[PDB]
Amino acid sequence: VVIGIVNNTVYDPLQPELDSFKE
Amino acid sequence: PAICHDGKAHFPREGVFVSNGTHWFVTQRNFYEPQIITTDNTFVSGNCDVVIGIVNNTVYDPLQPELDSFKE
Amino acid sequence: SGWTFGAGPALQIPFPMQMAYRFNGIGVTQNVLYENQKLIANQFNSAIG
Numbered sequence: 697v698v699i700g701i702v703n704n705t706v707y708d709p710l711q712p713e714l715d716s717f718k719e
Numbered sequence: 720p721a722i723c724h725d726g727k728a729h730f731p732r733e734g735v736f737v738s739n740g741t742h743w744f745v746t747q748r749n750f751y752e753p754q755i756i757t758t759d760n761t762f763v764s765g766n767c768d769v770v771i772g773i774v775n776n777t778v779y780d781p782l783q784p785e786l787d788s789f790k791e
Numbered sequence: 792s793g794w795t796f797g798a799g800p801a802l803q804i805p806f807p808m809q810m811a812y813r814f815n816g817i818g819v820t821q822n823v824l825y826e827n828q829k830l831i832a833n834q835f836n837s838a839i840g
């Protein structure tokens with residue numbers, strides 16, 4: 697619905713930090 | 720005016736609490752856009768027995784289910 | 792109705808919430824009035840007297 701949107705990814709600070717430690 | 724979940728009062732960061740009859744949401748003042756009452760758009764201060772007109776409800780937590788399901 | 796009756800149709804609202812908004816306007820958070828409501832009301836009444 698938003699006219700002119702683009703494509704990109706957004707970094708999440710929590711995900712790698714709590715995925716590396718959980719292993 | 721406030722919501723008390725764990726014996727602690729929760730106040731909106733910017734907006735007003737509104738109940739449609741069954742649930743409770745937080746909305747902006749000049750337009751109707753309800754949202755789930757998480758712990759990110761509210762702040763905690765004081766006990767549960769200092770304010771007047773408080774109600775009883777639970778506040779959603781986004782990290783707890785995500786990290787309890789994964790930590791298993 | 793607070794200030795909402797100047798722009799468009801009036802919108803009812805409880806008074807303590809209106810005072811909370813007016814403290815929030817000048818940079819004082821809402822967690823002050825909801826505690827000091829009794830003292831604030833007493834001071835207001837004394838001044839208006």
Ligand SMILES: *[C@@H]1O[C@H](CO)[C@@H](O[C@@H]2O[C@H](CO)[C@@H](O)[C@H](O)[C@H]2NC(C)=O)[C@H](O)[C@H]1NC(C)=O
Pocket residue numbers: 702703
């Ligand atoms: C941004 O990425 C999405 C995919 O996540 C694109 O959506 C699909 O794009 C493909 C082409 O790569 C099309 O064949 C599909 O029909 C698209 N599906 C939908 C539901 O739109 C999207 O096109 C990308 N953005 C742009 C501007 O191309």
Ligand SMILES: *[C@@H]1O[C@H](CO)[C@@H](O[C@@H]2O[C@H](CO)[C@@H](O)[C@H](O)[C@H]2NC(C)=O)[C@H](O)[C@H]1NC(C)=O
Pocket residue numbers: 739740741742
């Ligand atoms: C008040 O809002 C709540 C939002 O959760 C409504 O509850 C949902 O209503 C839809 C409509 O049938 C159901 O499909 C959902 O399953 C309901 N949610 C839950 C958790 O049960 C509620 O109906 C609204 N009240 C009124 C009077 O409209």
Ligand SMILES: *[C@@H]1O[C@H](CO)[C@@H](O[C@@H]2O[C@H](CO)[C@@H](O)[C@H](O)[C@H]2NC(C)=O)[C@H](O)[C@H]1NC(C)=O
Pocket residue numbers: 774775
């Ligand atoms: C909100 O929940 C709390 C409990 O977390 C209620 O506090 C107790 O409620 C029971 C029954 O409602 C009373 O018998 C106790 O005396 C209450 N204890 C305290 C310390 O308040 C509280 O009453 C609930 N609020 C409402 C409006 O029902």
